[PDB]
Amino acid sequence: MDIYVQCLSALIGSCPDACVDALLDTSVQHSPHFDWVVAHIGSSFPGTIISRVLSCGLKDFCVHGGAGGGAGSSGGSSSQTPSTDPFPGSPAIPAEKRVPKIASVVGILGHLASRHGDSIRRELLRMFHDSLAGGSGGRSGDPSLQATVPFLLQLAVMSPALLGTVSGELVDCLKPPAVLSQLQQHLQGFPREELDNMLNLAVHLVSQASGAGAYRLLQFLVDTAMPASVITTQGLAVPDTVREACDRLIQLLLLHLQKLVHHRGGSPGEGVLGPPPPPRLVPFLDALKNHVGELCGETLRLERKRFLWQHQLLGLLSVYTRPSCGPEALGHLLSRARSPEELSLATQLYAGLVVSLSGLLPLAFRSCLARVHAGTLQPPFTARFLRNLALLVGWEQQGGEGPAALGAHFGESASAHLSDLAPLLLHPEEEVAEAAASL
Amino acid sequence: YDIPASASVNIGQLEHQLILSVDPWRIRQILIELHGMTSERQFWTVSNKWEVPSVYSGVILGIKDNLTRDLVYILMAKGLHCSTVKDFSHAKQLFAACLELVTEFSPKLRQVMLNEMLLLDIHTHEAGTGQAGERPPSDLISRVRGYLEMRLPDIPLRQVIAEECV
């Protein structure tokens, strides 16, 4: 009976014929009468292992889905555990298309838990076949992208609890993130405030140089991922590294080293990508594209070394993105700049952008002056910007080695942009009028 | 930071300094030390921003020695970028050191480099001397006249250079 039903299902899967429709209906009627989840799972498992590697069939798939739905309607915890075990044991062709075909919330949660356990065992055993099975289970869970945030949160909570298997669980979670492109990146960044950070520091202390290499790979993955809240991720990283807000000095040093490694990886990503092939999009960079201005705000707020780090980050971001955001960054920094150290920061980033690109001063002047003549750019900001230009053109009129090394030609740039400056002379704000008069 | 205790990030810092570098001798030292402490790999593909025209790129990449071809590649790319930025001082320095680099190499390559001399001198006299230049020294004028009147070997002439000198 069961063998005949499996043969009919395989024949329907191979040849699309209607000769197995009545047999499938009779099998579905017999299975509901039996009300055996174990028998339904047993009929589904050999049937899938045959007619998923043989050929795809709609009627056989519907019959297997009905049997799995009956098995899931029954309780069957041990049946679902043996069904998950037979599915990993026979991962032939559409095993992922068969196991995740239930599309139930409880079944998907159980499959995710079983895949997490299989991946943990794979990371513990360091076996290639077990790692491939765990990756297949993770890919099956990723295609069923209904709700994986609670499973990821449970996995992260379980990993920070231990110290011995914590490094292996973290490596398995990082590899699954490297395969699934870090879907819950914001959720991963948000929870580890101080206690998970201390637990991870203890786990890394218990780990070894292999753990250090895994941490470097995870830093590379985090740099090549996390488009959701790149600003929040960078703010969490920089306060824990430069501001020394981390609970452990070793954790702060590791954060600083990871920031340096991410900067180096982005720089190789920016430059060593290749001139003949098209460049690859960086999620972190094109997510910070919308928050370029606030990064300039932190840089002007001038932390210990975070301002240097964000200076390099803004430079590499400007090199990376195609409109190059150089006029925007220069205009924002000149608008909110008030002292020669920020002016020197402007000159240094200009030096980077002028050995990188061209047109920076004309683009910056048109952008900033258009924003001035618009409704934005409040009188204090524009007074600061105009008088910063006055200091720059004065320095370039003087200067003997500075402007000679960094020839910016502010004089010819503003001489091109003379025409719009007369309304700034007649501007009703006295400071704006004075700055325009000086310029 | 210096001495980063890892070869990969040391290479990254060194190539970042190489990109930032303007002195041709310092570029030569950095690239020769990188070739020493790495394998025989080309390193101009550490910066995709450096643009070379393909016609000159073929003959600049038709060099057997990876070190010499990488040195001359970075030199002419950085100098062409400086010429676009109108930085004729550093451009003249880089192209001069490229001249003493290519004098050992092929007459075809150094004749292309002499056409680069001609174009750089034209642009330098156009911008550095200003539009109010009262009189060219006419040595470069005689050089342009002689080059245009000879046009002899199979050097790939650039129409940009031709229209500039005309």
Curated annotation (Swiss-Prot), chain A:
The gene is INTS5. Component of the Integrator complex, composed of core subunits INTS1, INTS2, INTS3, INTS4, INTS5, INTS6, INTS7, INTS8, INTS9/RC74, INTS10, INTS11/CPSF3L, INTS12, INTS13, INTS14 and INTS15. The core complex associates with protein phosphatase 2A subunits PPP2CA and PPP2R1A, to form the Integrator-PP2A (INTAC) complex. Component of the integrator complex, a multiprotein complex that terminates RNA polymerase II (Pol II) transcription in the promoter-proximal region of genes. Residues 72-94 are annotated as: Disordered. Signal peptide: none annotated. It comes from Homo sapiens. The chain holds residues 190 to 628 of 1019 of the full protein. Belongs to the Integrator subunit 5 family. The modification Phosphoserine is found at S90. This is Integrator complex subunit 5. It comes from the Eukaryota. It is found in: Nucleus; Cytoplasm; Nucleus membrane. The chain crosses the membrane at residues 345-365.
Swiss-Prot record, chain B:
It is found in: Nucleus; Chromosome. Disulfide bonds: none annotated. Coiled coil: none annotated. Component of the integrator complex, a multiprotein complex that terminates RNA polymerase II (Pol II) transcription in the promoter-proximal region of genes. Belongs to the Integrator subunit 8 family. TPR repeats lie at residues 72-105. Component of the Integrator complex, composed of core subunits INTS1, INTS2, INTS3, INTS4, INTS5, INTS6, INTS7, INTS8, INTS9/RC74, INTS10, INTS11/CPSF3L, INTS12, INTS13, INTS14 and INTS15. The core complex associates with protein phosphatase 2A subunits PPP2CA and PPP2R1A, to form the Integrator-PP2A (INTAC) complex. It comes from Homo sapiens. This is Integrator complex subunit 8. The chain holds residues 499 to 664 of 995 of the full protein.
